[PDB]
Symmetry: C5
Subunit: 362 residues, 5 copies
């Protein structure tokens, strides 16, 4: 029978001794805050500035003794979010972030629900440009581990304690997909406490293990390099007397291998360690460069042939240099793709075992 | 005869018991909100970040019993938008969005119209960077279905219910055109209710079917690839003894096919499935590569010819290798464009039937 | 003798019955608002997102009967812009716009001048990213017509009427120049009234006719294409037996024509109609491709010559094929630039007459 | 002995008749405002959108008679910047600007100092994206004159007059350097008064003469073009019978000259007048194109030689065509670099005299 | 026993004489402020606009006598950051900065702690786009010294004095790494006082010495240039009669050296001094150009050979020109890589000694 306006100005009134600046149960045990997040959107992962953009529904549960009411019989009592000025919302800030803008569209995207015993549910929708450092030791295949850290500002560990939720940890939205990565099902909850000269502060973090998909990099980078190496193999069947043809074919394959290697590393930060694509493009470039060196040795042997022919064992030395120049081409035509196939299976199995070692060590 | 200032401070006065924080007909049936949007601008569709930018006139109709007035005889009573602080606007937020900024130019772009019985018309102009996931299984021709979701924050299904309008669904502005797409005439209205641990929330959505126009991709991508394949066909008429000419022509056609294929995929996200342009550029690249292989086989047969000529059935084996080397060119000159025409009609009709299957299944 | 503070708190005081929420002459004829704009900056015209950025001094003149004063003898009475909270500024918003931010530097850039009879002058400085659709049927030469629409939000046609000024329409700043376009001297004032389900709203618009300057596109695009076609003509004088030279020259001219055509269309939206540069680059590419086909026919005739010479009317058939192979080069050397000159004068006069037809139809 | 709180609420109190909306010495002579700016940062000069970014310390000095105090004996009395709401700051706005955001970091970056007789010192730190039109008649060497205009909004010339400072004009920070330009020591102070239909408004402007440094453009653009022309000269020493070598060398030099000319104009607005780099790249491209034409004439004369040799004064006509084909190469080998050196010294001295004429006319 | 609300409204109440506009110990000695910063994130260093982005925890310690309390026995008394409106926070602003936005996510990221004797701890989290000028005299290896200046606005040196902290200077976060640079362990604290016409202002600055990592630039830039020079060395073994082969190989190596040099300078400001990569690419380009000149001299000597052979000491002059043309190739094949190795060791040791001289002079 009681009207709701006096009831919802009674608990936050200045005739009441609420004092929203003062934390609950002052001069006592620390407040325990339970947090669960809901990943609404995850994406826009950029490697060159090492950050990613999430959309989260940050839900914070804490108990306030002064907020308890015994008049109304309903337990939930969902409230309007405009009177969220004097409730004592806890301070929370993300340790590694940029941006972090609120959503003010059509209303402030906020949820306030005060239970009968004093439990408060506080939900806010925020997009954060979270910055995570990434390791690029293996660029085509890799398991990145993005770190999201939630800690407090201005309340030490003896006054405010952040804890993860027990029923579930992180709720991902159904149907959420990433175009370039695959989000793993398990998520780590390791809370570490940062120490500062001012004091220690409560901090909880969650880790997402991101598997990079290998379907795009196989089409864009691995197959055109094989096309270039196969073309340099095609140069072996051409006639050895046709010098501009073989020289031009080999030179253009080396040039396009260099430009392809320079263009695949363009969308990447300037890291200072050797990656896997470096190894792949280096061995492919070495293969086309060795093909050009093989033709240069063949044409040098033919040069020695032509100088000793035109100005005495001349016939059998002509035979020896033509037979040797034919033997080099005949053994190269078999030896080049076989050693390339050997390198391919060795590289692929060692990266398969180091990828499985990364997924086993985690 | 009554002056308007007391009348428009009477209904929102604190001497009145309006209490704009409290929802209408509290502790009763849920409020029913009818929404229709007006697409003022639609465009700026970007594939690489999978989002689009709309300009909408969001109109929300709901009934308030406390707002009803019986003094004035006029039914419409358009009001000034500055006193839209205490009216109980309903909470609405878009589920998949970025940005969503209001228009504050020369006034707040808002409309408030309170009917005599209590019906409230609330119109706001907002630009939203709506994020939609897109399928790129067929890149040149495709029918994208952009999804716009409108749901509530902080009021469950038992307190707030969102419904679409019956007289029309979505009003598009007259003369509105898209440079890259064609907006279909019908629009789906399927409302789905999202479930969360806190509770269930009302949500309505509208789907726009976007037909990608095929006029640009025919000019930019399909015809230059045919030019490259026709040039590789031109290489068959050149003399077989002119080895640097045919080798250089074929090698430059393969190189430019590779760079054209790499440059057409630049304005696209790094997806991990095979698209239609992948198939097209792959078959065209296979055609120019097979032309280079055909010349390599011709010059290998001529090599065998020259070695058996210069160091016995020599005349008729010279005839056999010249006749075979002529026969390969003569059959290739007919066989290459005919099998290309067969591939063209097969690819085009299978993509026509899969495009019509996509438009029939919807 | 009267001090100014009471006089300027008398007309906007709450002891006065001003009521700035209520429109002037309520329950009567509609308010008539006269608007003239002053183009301070115009520029930053981008084709790929189809919008332009203006800086305008929006001046709005309307009459308020309650604001009239008879105490002071001065007629102008320029006022301070801080008390522009309660004046009843009219609602105005641009129909096709993005951005539209106010200038808050060192003060709010505003002007308020209330005349003695009640005329109010309201000037504000705003930069608007106005979005206009453009037609690219003729890309090098074209007359774009940018549309600026000013309409009201929340006041129908019976309550608020917008009208253009009679003394002048749009004042452009002296010395204002555009690097890529030429602003015409006349400007259209056609007011159209938009109709919505809620009601009809007053709207006035102004059109600027923008002539695209042809000096840059002649240097960047038209002359290098002529350089490529002239180089392909140079290929006719080279010796026909030198096959790698003529083949390589023609192939590189075709390749660079393709890359030049692909690079000139890069700063353009993905439109689906044929433009004028498409026609120009297509005919130039057809010319260099026909030159390569002409050399392929010459070397095929020489192939027939060489096969019938080396394995009977042999001398006179050698004469016939050498004379025909010389005649093809001799007639091509004259016939190629003459038909190119014919195409040039036909293309140029038809685009001159369609440009003058566009400027005559307007 | 008087406490400072009553003294600094006495002069701005509502029990005082200060009335900060009303300008000082109302209904009298115009207020005289003295302005000096301090260039803290100058840079980020972009040619393609024709604007530059400054950081200025805007100091405004004006006299207020009502602010005068005779109680305290100190003359300076530096005040706290939070009570800068009611002081009657003058209206000032920059005529050609974008952005112009204030600095709110750790405090509002403001200075308020009220002298004993009524002199007020008002300093604010602002970064402005000032838009200046630039002339690109000579692109490598040029003296740009950036214009910064400071005028008033809403106060005419009879009420507010802006004047420059007498002790100095513009203070540049010590150690301030520009990477691409050189700031001259003198600065023009020409005040021009803008006229509008509403009235005339006071305006003062300052001009900075910016000398473009020529060290970068000599390395990036002038020397690689000389490398290309020297390579085309190297083509003269190669054997005339080696036709693919000379043809390929000349064709690749023409192609790379075209791409170098197209790439140096990329970071520039689409202007419609001929610049100096246009002239330079055009003459260099003409030189490499004439070298290709010279080889085409040599090989045409050799063609006439070969046709009259193989199907009568045959020996002496063979002599005449070989001697003429040698004479063309021998005279070209001397004549090409000498005429290039003549063009170089003529171009360089005419641009030196037109640069000195620009610096003498100013 | 005293409740906290009256105690925390007593010290900031208007019944108290706090007067937060007035600085502490007015008309006396200057306030001494001790500042220490905590580098939370450091990165996003861009060379082309010469600025870097930090995340700092700015801690300011100063003593206020009026804030001292003797009632409560606790010494720390951490307070809520909402009542940081009237505390007299000191004015601080960074001298060389852009941006500098506060963090408003979930609360204002602020810390307020008032000691018992009057010591105030004020911590704020800010991201600043700090602009630092950089010297690019040596581009691959360099030690940049970023300067962060903190000074006051509106309080002179006699009223406000800024001092660095004695216990530590700048705290870097543990685990913080930079992908492109290495942050040195020592940091300079040199405070310089800026002088202005208005007065002198306190300023303290901190310098970070940044070592550029050399691992990326060795892979991206130094090794492909060696690949190009090694390929030009490979051109010496090819047959001298094969003129299109050697000419084409040398010409494409010169062309790709030019494009590689133009592409490595793309991500750099337009500086006007010679860098180290300029010297490296210039010597490598000189090496490949000299190889092309060596082949041109060889083919000129062979031209003289062919003209004196075909139209008398003819045999021994044929011997002299073939022996000399062989001797040039034989001495070049040894002389080119040896002088390249000499240049490599000289360049590397002189840059090692100038890098160590830069790290010794600091
Ligand atoms: C085979 C290599 C040699 C070099 C051949 O290369 C060329 C011609 C002939 C050579 C012998 C080169 C190559 C294509 C082939 C033709 C082969 C087919 C048409 C396709 O390929 C197959 C193989 C591919 O598994 C390696 C396989 O993918 C799976 C992987 C995943 O399941 C594990 C899954 O995601 C999904 C099921 O799909 C799939 C069956 O498709 C063709 C689609 C390959 C892509 C072509 C690419 C298009 O743009 C690329 C690039 O811009 C380059 C410049 C041109 C193309 C090219 O490089 O062309 C290109 O790389 O011709
Ligand atoms: C003549 C064409 C053939 C192909 C010739 O081309 C080449 C060499 C010889 C060939 C026979 C090609 C060409 C230049 C010429 C040399 C000609 C001159 C030096 C200039 O040209 C004249 C002609 C031009 O009117 C067509 C005329 O403009 C007027 C137009 C307007 O009044 C109506 C007005 O705005 C103003 C008065 O100026 C003007 C008198 O200048 C030279 C300045 C032309 C520009 C050169 C361009 C620089 O970058 C361009 C591009 O990056 C490309 C890659 C290289 C250059 C080129 O393409 O070089 C380039 O295009 O040599
Ligand atoms: C040796 C030079 C000649 C020209 C050879 O070049 C080619 C073939 C054969 C020529 C004789 C060229 C070159 C690679 C080699 C093959 C050599 C190996 C595969 C690798 O190299 C070694 C040498 C390198 O120390 C110079 C050394 O790095 C250390 C430095 C640091 O410790 C001090 C530390 O960070 C870490 C330990 O690693 C390391 C042991 O790896 C290979 C990984 C080199 C990188 C290849 C690059 C990939 O993209 C680049 C570029 O896009 C270009 C276009 C193609 C590649 C290339 O240019 O290919 C490329 O540059 O083949
Ligand atoms: C740093 C230079 C390294 C290469 C110089 C070291 C290479 C070099 O010494 O050349 C040998 C050769 C003379 O050979 P030789 O010593 O028998 O007399 O010189 C030339 O004639 C043209 C060279 C082109 C000279 C081009 C000069 C730019």
């Amino acid at each position: 029978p009681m009207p709701p306006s006096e009831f919802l100005d009674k608990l936050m009134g200045k005739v009441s001794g609420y004092d929203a600046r003062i934390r609950p149960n002052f001069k006592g045990p620390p407040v325990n805050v339970t947090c669960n997040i809901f990943i609404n959107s995850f994406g826009s992962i950029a490697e060159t500035t090492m950050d990613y953009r999430v959309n989260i529904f940050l839900r914070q549960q804490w108990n306030d003794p002064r907020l308890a009411y015994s008049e109304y019989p309903d337990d939930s009592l969902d409230l309007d979010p405009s009177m969220l000025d004097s409730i004592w919302k806890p301070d929370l800030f993300f340790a590694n972030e940029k941006g972090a803008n609120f959503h003010e569209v059509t209303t402030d995207n906020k949820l306030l629900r005060i239970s009968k015993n004093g439990n408060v549910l506080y939900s806010i929708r925020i997009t954060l440009v979270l910055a995570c450092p990434m390791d690029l030791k293996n660029f085509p295949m890799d398991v990145q581990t993005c770190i999201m850290q939630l800690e407090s500002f201005g309340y030490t560990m003896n006054d405010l304690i952040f804890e993860w939720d027990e029923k579930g940890a992180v709720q991902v939205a159904d149907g959420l997909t990433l175009p370039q990565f695959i989000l793993k099902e398990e998520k780590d909850l390791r809370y570490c406490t940062k120490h500062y000269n001012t004091g220690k502060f409560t901090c909880i973090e969650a880790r997402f293990h991101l598997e990079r998909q290998m379907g795009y990099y196989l089409i864009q980078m691995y197959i055109p390099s094989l096309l270039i190496v196969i073309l340099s193999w095609v140069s072996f069947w051409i006639n050895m007397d046709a010098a501009p043809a073989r020289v031009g074919l080999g030179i253009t394959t080396v040039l396009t291998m260099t430009t392809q290697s320079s263009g695949s590393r363009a969308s990447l930060p300037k890291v200072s360690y050797v990656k896997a694509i470096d190894i792949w493009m280096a061995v492919c470039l070495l293969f086309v460069f060795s093909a050009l060196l093989e033709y240069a040795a063949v044409n040098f042997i033919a040069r020695q042939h032509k100088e000793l022919l035109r100005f005495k064992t001349v016939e059998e030395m002509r035979k020896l240099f033509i037979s040797r120049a034919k033997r080099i081409d005949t053994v190269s035509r078999v030896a080049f793709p076989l050693v390339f196939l050997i390198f391919n299976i060795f590289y692929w199995i060692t990266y398969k075992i180091i990828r499985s070692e990364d997924i086993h060590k985690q």
